[PDB]
Amino acid sequence: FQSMKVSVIIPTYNERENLEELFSRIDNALQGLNYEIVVVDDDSPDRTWEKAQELSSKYPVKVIRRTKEKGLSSAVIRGFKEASGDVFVVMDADLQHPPEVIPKLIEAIKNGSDIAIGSRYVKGGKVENWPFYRKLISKGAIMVGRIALPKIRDIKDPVSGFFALRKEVVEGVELNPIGFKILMEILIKGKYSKVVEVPFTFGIRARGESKLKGKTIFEYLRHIYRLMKWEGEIDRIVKFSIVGLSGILVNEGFLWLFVNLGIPKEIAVIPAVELSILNNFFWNDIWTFKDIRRGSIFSRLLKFHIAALSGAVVNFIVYWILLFLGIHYLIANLVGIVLSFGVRYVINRHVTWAT
């Protein structure tokens, strides 16, 4: 069936030796299928944009040197533009991504997926010769993206550099050239309805020096912030905070009201807090999250209470922990309130008004 063309897009920088075993193993895996390889190199000081060209005699290889421009994600944007295939496959040259599972990816694409991800962390997936501290900071950094961007909540490896997509997913789509996480840009900005994750084994880099670890992590946070903006999440947070402020005022306003109406001070505290909670729920349901209301309004009210109490507990715990650590009590109080706002937001976005 793959008379339809597959472009295998490979960003390189000082990859050398691998080309031989890379192209060999790719060809073996994609035997007799219609495919091209699209190497996009940013003027390596080291030997190839042109070592790849001598292998053009043995392999269907198109080579691109960008000399004005530089960057991993940027290279893949370029590879998209220059590829002529129906299906794009993206991967690294160092053989950490095994060409032998490329068939499983395109197979997933043929079966109806718009996007097939090579995933270290789905059932079956592996990453060999890694400490578990290393593996968990990885899943940790990922979890930050899965929580901050509800759209990729169910994607266990959205930072993977190993994936396939139908050409249509990225056609007419403007992808941000900054960074290292092109897959994440696509999951947020691309056109698709089905994504699957395909287990594979992350291999040891056979040969050559490492050009990323570690520059990625800060860019990755800056990237998540850019995506949060694009997705409307930053705008929801600002409204949620504005509504939060109104709640603090309403809480005090009823508290003052109840003491001059006869009600004792610590019996008054509770109706005051409940009214502030209800106030906060009302404005969030018709403003902050007006567009993603589901089910009964009572079910959401109840869940909103869980998020409010969770916020209160987090505020309590964080505060006392910072005091024991010797932080000034006003900083401790400020961090308390901000972490409580963050946790309330997350639980509301993911539970109360989940998408």
Ligand X SMILES: Nc1nc2c(ncn2[C@@H]2O[C@H](COP(=O)(O)OP(=O)(O)O[C@H]3O[C@H](CO)[C@@H](O)[C@H](O)[C@@H]3O)[C@@H](O)[C@H]2O)c(=O)[nH]1
Ligand Y SMILES: CCCCCCCCCCCC[N+](C)(C)[O-]
Asked if 280 interacts with Cl ion (CB under 5 A), we say: yes
Q: Does 287 bind ligand Y (CB under 6 A)?
A: yes
> Residue 286 touches which of Cl ion, ligand X, ligand Y, none (CB < 5 to 8 A by kind)?
ligand Y
94 scored as a contact of Mn ion (CB under 5 A): yes
280 touches which of Cl ion, ligand X, Mn ion, none (CB within 5 to 8 A by kind)? Cl ion
116 strand-pairing partners: 164, 196
Task: Give me 272's structure tokens.
Answer: 């005051």
Cβ-based nearer residue to ligand X, 178 or 301: 178
The window from 48-56, 61-69, 133-141, 270-278 that contacts ligand Y (CB under 6 A) reads 270-278
| By the rule CB under 6 A, 273 interacts with ligand Y | yes
Give the Cα separation of 269 and 315 in Å (integer). Answer: 18
User: 205 with 96: CB under 8 angstroms?
Assistant: yes
Q: By C-beta, is 209 or 235 nearer to ligand X?
A: 209
What gap in Å lies between CA 189 and CA 123, rounded to an integer?
Answer: 26
Q: How far is CA 228 from CA 65, 87, 142, 159, 342, in A?
A: 33, 28, 15, 16, 14
Please state the closest distance from residue 69 (CB atom) to Cl ion, in A: 46
- Binding status of residue 159 toward ligand X by CB under 6 A: yes
Q: Is 282 exposed, middle or buried (0-12, 13-18, 19+ CB in 10 A)?
A: middle
Pairing of strands 126-127, 6-12: unpaired
Please report which helix (H) or strand (E) contains residue 165, including its range.
strand 163-166
| 210 interacts with ligand X by CB under 6 A | yes
Token pair of 152, please?
Answer: 């990729």
Mark the segment that binds ligand Y (CB under 6 A) among 39-47, 92-100, 251-259, 294-302: 251-259
Q: Per CB under 6 A, which of residues 301..330 are in contact with ligand Y?
A: 308-309, 312, 317, 320
Question: What distance in Å separates the CA atoms of residue 102 and residue 89, rounded to the nearest whole number?
Answer: 8
341 binds ligand Y (CB under 6 A): no
Residue 329 annotated in ligand binding: no
Residue 171 is assigned to a ligand binding site: no
Question: Does 253 participate in binding ligand Y (rule CB under 6 A)?
Answer: yes
* Distant-in-sequence, close-in-space partners of 51: CB < 8 Å, separation ≥ 6: 16, 19
Six-digit token string for 84? 């002529």
Distance (Å, whole) CA 52 – CA 38: 10
Instruction: Tell me whether residue 92 is annotated as binding.
Output: yes
Annotation-wise, does 154 bind a ligand? no
The letter for the amino acid at 341 is: F
Total of chain residues touching ligand Y, rule CB under 6 A: 25
250 part of the interface to ligand Y, by CB under 6 A:
yes
- The binding site for Mg(2+) comprises 94, 96
Residues engaged in binding ligand Y (CB under 6 A): 242-243, 245-251, 253-254, 256-257, 273, 276-277, 280, 283, 286-287, 308-309, 312, 317, 320
Residues engaged in binding Cl ion (CB under 5 A): 280, 344
